[PDB]
Symmetry: D2
Subunit: 437 residues, 4 copies
């Protein structure tokens, strides 16, 4: 029990303020994903600072609503791919006037962070209440424009699933999920840049698991060749796969944002649209599932085949609901049984990223096996929102038990508990702070 709940919350917040304190090289840029989770970690201790994190992200939102996956603080510190590689400032009609951003997106966890800010703000008085109210007044339209872009421009055919054009957009790129989609990307001659002819991809979780690095950059070249135009990307992109996990998060996020719109008297037509997308994508997720187990499947749009992999993404339906009782029960059995949380070799009953009995299991490599506390955080938060109060409590209790040595790595070896790596911000610290406070 190396840290008590107060000591652990103190250590988590210290490891979110980032000052003084192997660790990773920290860059000044801002990540869509990290921003949402820092906001969730911040809301317990500072609503103002949580609001500033989202305000800063959202001021880099594209004019069509897309939130890009990175916002660069500059173009000289050698981050790759950087502003020079993406070139959205000159190429994309919708890149913002005064911000440098990438040209891909990231899962819509943002409405979850907004809900955390508003919930914590309501218990804190008048001044802080008005800070959260002011944020909502200033950013509701932008959150709506983000959800509307995903629904209209990444579900052009109203199938209720979000289409990804890069594994990087999933949040879960070093994963078995995409291996077969990526295997059909065959790159040509990459153009000549001023960067080296072999520049290392800076974020190591974004490196391809087999150094097939041209594949990843070739997708960028296809995006740039149509200037990131959402109307033209389906004609030229070599990677087009409907991500069923992203889709379920989107459904949850639409339901959360609708409930926010009703609690805070937002325009009724927006609430209706939000409710409608939430049910559209709930059905889209369910449409992918196995008839026996309920497991969700990603869909390779180009290959026209259900991708079949044994990762945590299978459990997408448990986040957003929609399964019939029998198949939801089936799927919970899978989640809690020996292929996942009940695998007898696991040190803790957190969710492994890939099933230890899968052929693709790699106990040390990112989402191919290792345990990520932020994944268990997300399930526990979604379970509580679905009414699975005691399932949510047991996950939270298990996440805290694992986190209480105060290591705060972002992923751990699923059998030995060894901490395996840290991200730019500590998603695990944010998960622990939300769990405790």
């Amino acid at each position: 029990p190396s840290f008590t709940p107060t000591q652990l919350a103190a250590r988590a917040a210290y490891l979110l303020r980032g000052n003084d304190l192997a660790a990773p090289l920290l860059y000044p840029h801002m990540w869509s994903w990290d921003a949402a989770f820092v906001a969730i970690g911040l809301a317990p201790l500072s609503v103002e600072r949580a609001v500033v994190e989202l305000d800063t992200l959202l001021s880099a939102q594209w004019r069509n609503g897309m939130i890009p996956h990175i916002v660069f603080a500059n173009g000289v510190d050698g981050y790759f791919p950087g502003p020079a590689r993406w070139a959205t400032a000159t190429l994309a009609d919708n890149a913002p006037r005064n911000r440098l951003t990438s040209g891909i997106t990231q899962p819509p966890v943002h409405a979850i962070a907004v809900q955390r800010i508003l919930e914590h703000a309501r218990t804190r008085g008048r001044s802080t209440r008005a800070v959260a109210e002011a944020f909502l007044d200033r950013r509701w339209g932008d959150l709506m424009r983000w959800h509307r872009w995903l629904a209209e421009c990444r579900d052009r055919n109203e199938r209720g699933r979000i289409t990804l054009y890069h594994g990087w957009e999933s949040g879960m790129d070093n994963s078995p999920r995409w291996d077969s989609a990526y295997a059909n990307v065959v790159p040509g001659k990459l153009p000549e840049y001023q960067r080296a002819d072999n520049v290392i991809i800076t974020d190591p979780s974004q490196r391809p698991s087999d150094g097939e690095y041209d594949r990843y950059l070739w997708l960028l070249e296809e995006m740039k060749a149509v200037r990131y135009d959402d109307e033209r990307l389906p004609s030229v992109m070599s990677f087009q796969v409907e991500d069923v996990f992203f889709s379920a998060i989107f459904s949850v996020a639409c339901q959360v944002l609708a409930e926010i719109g009703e609690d805070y008297k937002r325009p009724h037509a927006d609430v209706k649209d939000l409710y409608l997308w939430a049910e559209r994508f709930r059905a889209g997720v369910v449409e992918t599932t196995d008839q026996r187990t309920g497991a969700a499947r990603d869909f390779d749009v180009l290959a026209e085949k259900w991708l079949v992999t044994e990762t945590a993404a299978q459990f997408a339906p448990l986040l957003c609901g929609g399964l019939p009782h029998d198949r939801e029960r089936a799927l919970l059995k899978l989640l809690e049984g020996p292929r996942f949380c009940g695998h007898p070799d696991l040190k803790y009953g957190l969710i492994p990223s890939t099933s230890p009995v899968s052929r693709d299991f790699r106990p040390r490599e990112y989402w191919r096996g290792p345990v990520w506390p932020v994944l268990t955080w997300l399930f526990s938060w979604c379970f509580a929102r679905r009414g699975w109060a005691e399932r949510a409590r047991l996950l939270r209790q298990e996440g805290l038990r694992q986190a209480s040595d105060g290591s705060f790595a972002e992923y751990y070896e699923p059998f030995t508990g060894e901490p395996l790596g840290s991200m730019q911000q500590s998603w695990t610290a944010a998960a622990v702070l939300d769990w405790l406070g």
Copy 2:
């Protein structure tokens, strides 16, 4: 109706404290890269609950600026180029003080010895944390024990040259409590001459507002510096030239507590028997020295102006010095506890909380918005609650801690508060209140 839930639960409050620990940017003060002896000790106290290694790094950094004779100076300057005043140029310790450290810019005065308390919090937390962290705490003590002994030895030998068991201060700044009724009459006898012409403006503001003289008699404060410089900060010569020499009874009691604490550390970690004996000897010298000052009926302690040869009588929290270190006979301690808990201090009916006011609200010197002339400082309550616990006053300790946590639960993390309205009044460079809260909770 039963009290409403505070803005912050204990885990939320501990998180907010850890987030703010090295400065409340959440009206905020101007932050400098320099390191303060007092702030460093309390940041180390706040850090030990959440990271022993980071706490150790804070004291390692301070102690590497120790003077060759053992004095820990009140500031270590990160640079002499950002305009903090008085800075390296005004102090000129690097050229004038033989004992100033070779590769470190510092001031030439000292600060209360709360460091042994910080070391005790580091070692106490480290013991519970597994052998790797236990090792970083033992490595620290092996490397810094000599240094902590030499600090205490300097205070006992050079600021109590006549073995009276009280620490002599050459400036109100050395007390940690400068803006206070305690020193007004001693300052009123400092009469500056023609101050030398420096390269700064002749009007140059003292950067730290808690250090500005309450009356703007700023020449007085800077004149004491010139006296120190005139004798090159030589401990043998300062008593001949300083216009300010007062025995600080609060500093003296903290020193007594510190020697006792360090001595217990020295035994638990097989430090040299001769150091421990010395430490225990000083702890008793200064305990009795504190008691020697006390009022015969209330037990209240008194500072002593060495030059005026006069017991200074003021009604500030410094009167309760004997409660920290012990030593009072039983009936005067009860008397003094009655004074502390009664209507002149914690039981004053206008106080929002029962934390200790820095000056008694019924005193003529009471100013409810000015630093130590009345306002409530959580770090003072923390210091009392920690000392009460070590004296075996378990319930008194518990109730101070409870009351400090009640007051901190709005998350304001100011260093001092209006004692009647609870309005937060100012922040220091590091948040001592955040450190107090982290220790109380962690």
Copy 3:
């Protein structure tokens, strides 16, 4: 803050063990309602003792499935109405062989207590786990037979609402809800008994609010005249009203017991029936509601009129779900607005039993105004089960704040906080223990 959470849990459990310690005269008999809540209060500290409380109740279950509202420990201590007045031993074909019981029922909170026992049992090992498993193996059939009796014999016309034949069956008799139904009960000459010609009703919450005591006993005489025969009661009873609160609890209880059957591999046909009743009664509750506010209405079956009263029973739909978003939002506004929890004169934001602005409001008289912590407990537990995690948390936080003086009365004056009375067992202690532990 007169008691800390540990001190308050200790005091609550002391005031549930009943020994040593104005207060009420405690009788050796066992109440259906009190038994369920004592079990909920006991599960945190002793699963075994919780199981013994329900086992003891259920061994007095009638052969048709009805759980009676009282189980008498004897017929000599002068409780009235006692075994001699009810006479179910000689009259009712289904009264149990070796137990003395009343001839009326009580809301089905029992499945909620069973869920608390199983949840707490799972975290406590092997021996205690087997104790809860053994209970379920022994009592699942009986819980099914209780739910089946309510659905088949108190909803004979499959309207999805439970019919009551006595205000005493509602759990909420001293209430504005029934005043107009009771006003149409006109009694004849009551038969001669050996008891006095004026025996005080022992439980004071069961006394009629206007000493029209003959009305209450006359209903008993109608039940006895057809020997409590469920097939004949609708022909002879002068009080027949569909209780929409009881109905919503029943729906929640069916959903809870179905989820129990799935977690603990109970027979699948039972789970199907449970799910079916849960949705039948959810719809029945919704069918009563106001088109503007969503407020639920009780139905007087004989008068054929919707009873319109401004009590907490209006909020029945919030317990079991089923309203459309707009009307659920409307109804939450009513609950949280100035007619109820946000009435500015209330000392705490617990739910008043009747709206302070209603004409029927009586700030000192049982369910006509006063604040009952067990009512707020039930809403908060149902809210958490519906996913309203932060609404559940704020109610629980408010209930604890009110309870932390350690007074443990069952109801309080809604404006001054004055404790107004104690029941046989402390439902409030059970609520506090569940909230804390």
Copy 4:
């Protein structure tokens, strides 16, 4: 892997403790309506967190059975008709003891004076609870102060007739720790004669198993009773006739702690100055009396057989008596703490938890399943942690409490546990462990 969550959280555990407080019916023991002096004190300690009035009623009931000379007897019988043995018939105090209370059946021996500790827990909790409950606690003290003084005065005057500062026991039962190596050699010198023929079976079992002689030498135990009866329990005559007279150094230290605690209560509630002075005087008499027994190198305390005129040397937790009351010179206290924390006691590597074993596992007398010959009693750890806190040993106190709570978290609430396996071994009439847990948490 990081430790798994215990069967009970602190609120659940506090609830379970309060539910069990007056007897673990959840293998359970046979419960009698009688009241035990020792159990009554600890039930009052367990009750104060949850009900001051109920705690006050528990001591009021005990104290109404006090003898006219101040002795609190170890049992108050609710009746003499349920067959508890030895009962009113065997003790015959109602006819033989001039000082036995008029309308209350009691035994004729005493028990350690832990009552002042219970009073301190009642008053401490009452102070925080509002004026109505503050009033019921002041009313109790007004009514029972004389009585508590007369109890302490009886112990100081009649069980330390020669002002040696140690309490003389006339039976192992009076120690609260009868089934223990501490008394084996003193018992081995009791040689019974023809025991008188009573109306019970000649074989009649001692009802309380912790009171049965370990060796079934039951004649010895009952023979001491006959000696007491032969002199009508007269304090002046018992030293002439008793075959068992040993100074109990643990009882003596608890008495010293008790006098100190009661004296602090007497000042805080304006009790008579002469009572407080007496209390402080006895507290120091018995502190020094305890220290007088101690080993010269370890500081371990020793019981003294008055008749054999011999220091009893046994390796039980009673050696640590000086840690409770203070008084040891600094270096022998460190020695004795090294013994307590080291491999013969808390640091024994085979122990499941670091609670204090009743007998050292390396002793030849160590029996791991037999009462005080080895097993772990949470109430002993509670008593040490409470005394450590009053001595200012804040961290040692905290770590005992933490360790006791760790061990109690399975909810077993036994009074003593196998020290190697943690297996619960037996319950008393009231759950002292439940009271310890409620105090630690409440």
